[PDB]
Design a binder for these strands. Structure first.
Lengths: 64, 51, 198, 278, 42, 70, 271
RNA sequence: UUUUUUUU
RNA sequence: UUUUUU
RNA sequence: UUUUUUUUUUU
């Protein structure tokens, strides 16, 4: 469930699925009371950042 | 919350919804029509062409 | 003698099994086939295209959720599709004349025969994630390898009985990579049994 | 029709002559001209007016990042058009606030445009829109299959006489070159020698399949990707244009109904333009 | 004695830095994406 | 020899090579030439992707010549 | 090294020697697959096509092919599954106990909780085919939100929307509560299929069947015929194995012609 | 539908 | 060199 | 018995 949410947030910001871009929403935050859950959520964030931003694109050494 | 259960035939698999993707709706429609056939589906044919 | 209407009892275990003189009776069984081959070839092209187009928007996990495909199964579709197309565009060799072991040749015949009788599957039918269920998977499933016992014996009493001794994890050696270079590959040997970390 | 197949009935015309596949147009450079490509880009840029513009980023200019340069040879960005769109100058919309606001908007839009392609690379059709076309593509092709099956007997019977005119003529030359004469041969064996049961059955099977192989669109070796490549790309050009002129070409004088139909008919023009053989 | 780690492992983590969570920032599209976890109606 | 291998792993300081470092004068210029050639080769392949052609003939005998990267 | 076998060299199929028997000479006969039970999920063609027009009219399906590629979509399984569903849920149907006892019974019959896909049988928000009409289970709904909502809803949704049929039946579920109900007309229809009982009926089609001694004998051959577990494994090199088949291509036909050559010639000169 | 069944 | 054949 | 991998319980 965690990965679904995180992955969804990014798309909204960029407005991929929109012929006519209408930038209105520019602030998305997540709040969790549970410490355990919070930690987990963080992990998801990391994965989201990968394969999206060119500055965090990993590549195996043998193929690099 | 349960009582005397009466046998009733249901088809949960073939249940259109407002969240299913367009491809899923199409795929389920053709599959459902094949099982409901009572002339071709419920028959055994030895040869491939209608000899 | 006893009441237990469930599907996980001793007699109900391994339902529809020959217990008696019927074991020697010949019986036909369905032929298994991988899921990545039963799907419509048409859809495979489509799936591959998406993957190769935008890996970010179309991730390995998100792409398989719409069509109902596992993370491992969807990976093979792109890999097997890629090689088939590479030999055609480059005018190297035809897929039919391609060299491959006999294990794959028989598999191809089953795939063609599967569709000729029933037909190709327009959408996969499998769960992305597993589920803890009572099933018979080999002879090593219904056995306890920790205590090495088949029959558990316990004292009958209403009062709280003392708990059993919990097992400990097995410590084994592993290897990791620290520095990788084209002309040299350095690795580190980890020893969990060492008290001093340093 | 070809002179060889001059005996074909009226009922068997559409089989050997597959129709031109509805609205299947391609965007690859293998079937495009200089004139066509220019026209399509022009038609898009004509929406607004401008005379003065500035250079673009995606053009050498001491390249240092692997973002604004040539992408890897993927099978989605090989067709010619966007190399002729990215390096295009930043056109204007047309003292004091009349100029300061116009410059500010353009400058601001420039930065966003640059990063448009940096993170994402697919901003065309939606998930459902992509699937929509797919459904229809299968449906249209399924019909052809059905037809063939029905007409199995007709097709096969027709091809029987086709092979007779070829096997008889081909076998006549072979015997003349190999043999000496057929005047002293028994009349009974004369017919069998010219039309043997081996070549007649083999040629008929090969010729029967000849008629087949229609609807070459869903071809494994790069036959499906062609439609997708030409479909998705349509939306990308429109989006690009809008990006350049977001809040500098319209004062929000239209509702959703007018905007929805504005981009409807637009596509029509483009399809006709590109899909033309004059 | 071979069940849990000794004091050496705990000390090393203090220096390595392993002992506001995440922020996804995109210049131009999205301001920030903070995943700070705390009470809402505190 | 042991010191050299350990130096690359970062366990110990990298020892100097044979004849020292100050004498390494011609190698510095030679290394730059090799690095420059690699960068120039990159520029060559850039144009290829725009008009990639699996099959390319030549004006000799219409011979087929396949192209593949690695 | 280990060369030739030192032992009985008994056959894989498990047959005896002697005259008027399949096997004549002592040997292993590893290549003989005819004696081994194998399925036939393919198709076989004819040796001659009388039809003038070349057409694939000689293709025929195999008896074992129908069961080799089944499909869990046939109509005559749902009817049987529905009947078994009622007989499987009888322990909780006639359990006139409290919620604690009923809940435990349903848990064993169908494992379902948090993070697991349950069939939804027995939950308050689910429609079931009860023998007689009964009111919904409105006991779990809050009392504070319903009371405050009954006034703002208005007469439209207080006596004609849900209350018009909330007391039409004499029977009820979890007692009676005329004060607490659901003013909104949300239909809690639809259900879910089970994963345990459904998988058993589907697999039932794979086990269906269509001076003499008093007690029938049990030849050894019978055991090894179907079962492949008790069969000795191969030991010969693959190369030799493959070469044996090639040898037989031209050898076998010669043996057939050699036998008929003597018989046919004898009758043409004496008979 | 590929010199497929088919075998130095 | 023949026969069969989505 | 893995095209672009030197990785892969390949089967």
């Amino acid at each position: 469930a965690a990965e679904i949410l995180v992955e969804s947030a990014v798309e909204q910001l960029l407005q991929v699925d929109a012929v006519d871009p209408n930038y209105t929403l520019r602030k998305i935050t997540f709040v969790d009371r549970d410490a355990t859950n919070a930690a987990l959520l963080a992990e998801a964030a990391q994965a989201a950042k990968r394969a999206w931003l060119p500055e965090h694109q990993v590549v195996p050494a043998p193929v690099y | 919350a349960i009582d005397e259960v009466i046998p009733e035939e249901i088809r949960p698999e073939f249940t259109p919804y407002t969240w299913k993707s367009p491809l899923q709706k199409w795929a389920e429609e053709l599959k459902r029509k094949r099982l409901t056939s009572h002339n071709v589906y419920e028959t055994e044919v030895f040869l491939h062409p209608p000899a | 003698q006893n009441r237990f209407p469930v599907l996980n009892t001793a007699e109900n275990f391994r339902y529809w099994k020959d217990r008696g003189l019927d074991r020697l009776l010949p019986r036909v069984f369905p032929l298994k086939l991988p899921a990545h081959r039963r799907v419509d070839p048409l859809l495979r092209e489509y799936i591959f295209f998406l993957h190769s187009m935008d890996p970010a928007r179309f991730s390995i996990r998100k792409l398989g959720e719409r069509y109902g495909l596992k993370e491992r199964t969807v990976e093979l579709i792109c890999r097997e599709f890629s090689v088939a197309e590479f030999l055609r565009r480059t005018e190297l060799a035809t897929p039919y004349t391609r060299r491959v072991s006999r294990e794959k040749a028989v598999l191809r015949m089953k795939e063609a025969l599967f569709s000729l009788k029933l037909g190709y599957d327009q959408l996969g039918d499998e769960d992305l994630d597993e589920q803890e269920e009572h099933e018979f998977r080999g002879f090593r499933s219904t056995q306890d390898w920790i205590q090495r016992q088949n029959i558990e014996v316990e004292m009958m009493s209403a009062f709280p009985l003392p708990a059993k001794r919990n097992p400990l994890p097995k410590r084994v050696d592993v290897d990791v990579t620290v520095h990788n270079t084209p002309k040299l590959k350095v690795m580190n040997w980890i020893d969990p049994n060492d008290k001093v970390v340093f | 029709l070809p002179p060889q197949w001059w005996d074909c009935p009226e009922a068997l015309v559409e089989f050997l002559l597959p129709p031109p596949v509805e609205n299947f147009f391609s965007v690859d450079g293998a079937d495009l001209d200089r004139g066509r490509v220019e026209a399509v880009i022009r038609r898009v840029y004509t929406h607004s007016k401008a005379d003065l513009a500035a250079p673009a980023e995606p053009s050498a200019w001491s390249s240092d990042t692997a973002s604004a340069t040539g992408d890897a040879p993927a099978p989605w960005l090989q067709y010619p058009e966007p190399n002729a769109l990215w390096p295009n100058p930043l056109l204007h919309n047309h003292e004091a606030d009349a100029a300061a606001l116009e410059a500010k908007q353009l400058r601001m839009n420039k930065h966003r445009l640059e990063h448009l392609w940096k993170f994402a690379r697919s901003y065309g059709m939606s998930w459902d829109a992509l699937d929509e076309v797919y459904i229809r593509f299968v449906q249209l092709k399924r019909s052809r299959e059905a037809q063939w099956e029905a007409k199995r007997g007709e097709i096969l019977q027709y091809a029987a006489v086709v092979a007779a005119r070829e096997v008889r003529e081909k076998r006549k030359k072979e015997i003349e070159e190999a043999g000496m004469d057929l005047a002293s041969v028994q009349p009974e064996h004369r017919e069998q020698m010219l039309l043997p049961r081996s070549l007649y059955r083999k040629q008929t099977r090969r010729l029967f399949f000849e008629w087949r192989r229609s609807y070459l669109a869903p071809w494994r070796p790069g036959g499906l990707q062609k439609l997708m490549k030409a479909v998705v790309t349509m939306r990308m050009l429109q989006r690009e244009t809008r990006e350049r002129f977001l809040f500098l070409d319209e004062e929000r004088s239209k509702r959703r109904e007018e905007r929805e139909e504005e981009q409807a008919r637009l596509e029509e023009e483009l399809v006709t333009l590109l899909q033309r053989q004059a | 004695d071979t069940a849990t780690a000794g004091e050496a492992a705990r000390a090393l983590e203090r220096e390595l830095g392993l002992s506001l969570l995440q922020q996804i920032e995109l210049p131009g599209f999205g301001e920030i994406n903070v995943v700070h976890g705390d009470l809402l109606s505190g | 020899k042991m010191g050299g291998l350990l130096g690359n792993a970062g366990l110990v300081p990298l020892p100097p090579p044979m004849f020292g470092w100050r004498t390494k004068a011609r190698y510095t210029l030679l290394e730059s030439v090799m690095q420059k050639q690699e960068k120039l080769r990159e520029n060559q392949l850039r144009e290829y992707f725009k008009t990639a052609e699996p099959v390319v003939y030549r004006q000799v005998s219409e011979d087929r010549d396949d192209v593949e990267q690695e | 090294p280990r060369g030739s076998h030192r032992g009985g060299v008994f056959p894989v199929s498990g047959l005896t020697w002697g005259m008027n028997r399949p096997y004549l000479k002592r040997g292993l006969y590893q290549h003989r697959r005819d004696h081994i039970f194998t399925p036939r999920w393919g198709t076989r063609t004819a040796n001659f096509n009388p039809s003038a027009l070349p057409d694939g009219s000689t293709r025929r399906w195999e008896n074992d092919a129908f069961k080799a590629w089944p499909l869990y979509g046939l109509p005559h399984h749902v009817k049987l599954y529905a009947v078994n569903e009622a007989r499987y849920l009888v322990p909780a149907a006639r359990c006139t106990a409290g919620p604690e006892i009923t809940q435990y019974i349903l848990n064993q019959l169908d494992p379902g909780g948090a993070g697991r896909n349950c069939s939804g049988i027995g939950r308050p928000d689910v429609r079931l085919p009860l023998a007689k009409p009964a009111a919904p289970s409105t006991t779990h709904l809050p009392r504070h939100l319903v009371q405050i909502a009954r006034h703002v809803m208005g007469e439209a949704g207080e006596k004609v929307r849900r209350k018009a049929l909330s007391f039409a039946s004499t029977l009820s579920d979890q007692g009676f509560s005329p004060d607490v109900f659901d003013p909104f007309g949300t239909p809690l229809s639809e259900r879910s299929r089970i994963k345990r009982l459904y998988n058993l009926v589907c697999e039932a089609d794979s086990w269906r069947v269509k001076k003499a001694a008093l007690v029938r004998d049990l030849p050894l051959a019978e055991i090894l015929y179907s079962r492949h577990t008790h069969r000795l494994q191969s030991r010969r090199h693959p190369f030799w194995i493959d070469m044996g088949y090639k040898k037989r291509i031209v050898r076998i036909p010669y043996l057939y012609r050699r036998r008929v050559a003597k018989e046919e010639a004898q009758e043409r000169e004496f008979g």
